[PDB]
Amino acid sequence: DQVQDMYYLSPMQEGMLFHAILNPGQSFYLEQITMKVKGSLNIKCLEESMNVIMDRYDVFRTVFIHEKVKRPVQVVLKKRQFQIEEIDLTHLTGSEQTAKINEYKEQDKIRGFDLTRDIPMRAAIFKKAEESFEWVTSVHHIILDGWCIGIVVQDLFKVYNALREQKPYSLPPVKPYKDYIKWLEKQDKQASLRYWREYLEDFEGQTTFAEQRKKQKDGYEPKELLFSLPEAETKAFTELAKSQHTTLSTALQAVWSVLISRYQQSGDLAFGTVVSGRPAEIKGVEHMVGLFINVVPRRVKLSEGITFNDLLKQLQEQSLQSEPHQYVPLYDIQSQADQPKLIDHIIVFENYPLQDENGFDMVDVHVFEKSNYDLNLMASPGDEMLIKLAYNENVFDEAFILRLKSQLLTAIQQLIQNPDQPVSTINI
């Protein structure tokens, strides 16, 4: 028997499987990480390590069954042999190499995975010269969300550097993903839907930045504007969040709420927020690897005279309230609102972005994921906080995105200088 265990899918996994099967070739749920290596890499040993990781993390050994079954199940296989696709490009010119690697990345996006058979993760390493490699890893988020990859990479290099130097290693114990499925089977699914319904009671709908949306035919032209919050502002922003017993993520969502209240001319608004999805009742949940994070609606109410510190408190409390119900798929929430466009942009605060020795230099790490919203506000910590506006240029002009950058920066500065004044006083 190849099967170690078999159990049901989380609601989000089930939604993901259904949409993946029905929309093949479209890059859904696919993350592609490109690592450019400069230095010595022991590929054979890297492969050995990957297979240690295969046995360490049950999600990599999981496949899915949906045919001739009453309800889909995920099956953990006792052992699965991983193999790196190693490609030697050394006999090609530099332009040939790049074309070769882009060709691979483009066909890889279309290929996706057959979730009923494949390991939902693969790796190709391209050798371009003696000490230069390009290492493309693809993964399906039904087994591992984007905020988990770092954990796995860290363990992979720990195994790798021990194996190559012939040293012993030990790794901390990790709970299996089934433990999260078991936690989910104790939750009251109807109470969680009721939570979202009541939270969203009487919320009416909103096209964000409607007067700025280009009304063109459908299509996605992905663009990005990257910028940073200067260190002194970043410091004061962080101090304010700490002093108010909240997070940088919540503080940024609060500032964004003020900006959107002005464009929408309204005090009742919504946007999507990526939440961790990790239940505190699950001892050791921070070390688990699998699909946890979710996009949920954030609804913000701005009354007359509300201050920034008021807003920080309103959002911090609702985050905590929401925590037992973060497993509900957005689709099911939107159906409880008879509003398929309840939200149309999101805010993503990523504490530990993969994109910032082992005997080599990591020259660059780039992440690709397909875009599901026409505007995405993305931020990560640092001495100067890193902010990205990722948008669909077929909808928003670059000039408008640039105005949004200067408004966000001036709104941060003004709300941290006067966090106890009505946010209606801020000049944007």
Residue numbers in the entry: 7 to 362, 370 to 441
Paper text:
Nonribosomal peptides (NRPs) represent a valuable source of clinical therapeutics. These natural products are biosynthesized by multifunctional enzymatic assembly lines, called nonribosomal peptide synthetases (NRPSs), that use dedicated modules to incorporate each building block selectively and sequentially into the peptide scaffold. NRPS modules typically possess three core domains, which perform substrate selection and activation (adenylation or A domains), shuttling of activated substrates (thiolation or T domains, also called peptide carrier proteins, PCP or CP domains) and peptide bond formation (condensation or C domains), respectively. The enzymatic assembly line that produces the microbial lipopeptide antibiotic surfactin, surfactin synthetase, consists of the following three proteins: trimodular SrfA-A, trimodular SrfA-B and monomodular SrfA-C. The modules are composed of several functional domains, including C, A and T domains. In the current study, we re-engineered the donor substrate specificity of the SrfA-C C domain (green) to enable direct acylation of the acceptor Leu (residue 7, yellow highlight) with a fatty acid rather than an amino acid.
To gain insight into how the engineered SrfA-CFA variant recognizes and processes a lipid substrate, we attempted to crystallize its C domain in complex with substrate analogs. Two unrelated, highly diffracting crystal forms of the SrfA-CFA C domain were obtained and used to solve apo structures to high resolution. Variant 10, harboring mutations W143T, Y145V and F155I, was found to be the best catalyst for rapid fatty acylation of l-Leu, giving an apparent rate constant of 38 ± 7 min−1. In the SrfA-CFA structures, all mutations are clearly visible in electron density maps and introduce more space between the middle of helix 4 and the β sheet. Introduction of the W143T, Y145V and F155I mutations causes the following three connected changes: (1) the N-terminus of helix 4 shifts inward, toward the pocket mutations, by up to 2 Å; (2) the helix’s capping residue, Trp153, swings over to interact with the base of the latch; and (3) the latch shifts to pack Leu360 into the mutated pocket. However, in this conformation, the active site is not connected to the expanded mutated pocket, mainly because of the position of Glu37 and Leu360. Nevertheless, a reasonable 10-undecynoyl-ppant-TycA* model can be made that positions the distal end of the 10-undecynoyl moiety into the expanded pocket. Although this model is consistent with the mutations improving activity, cocrystal structures will ultimately be required to corroborate the proposed binding mode. Structure-based considerations would certainly have included mutation of Glu37 to a smaller residue, as the side chain of Glu37 blocks the fatty acid pocket in all crystal structures.
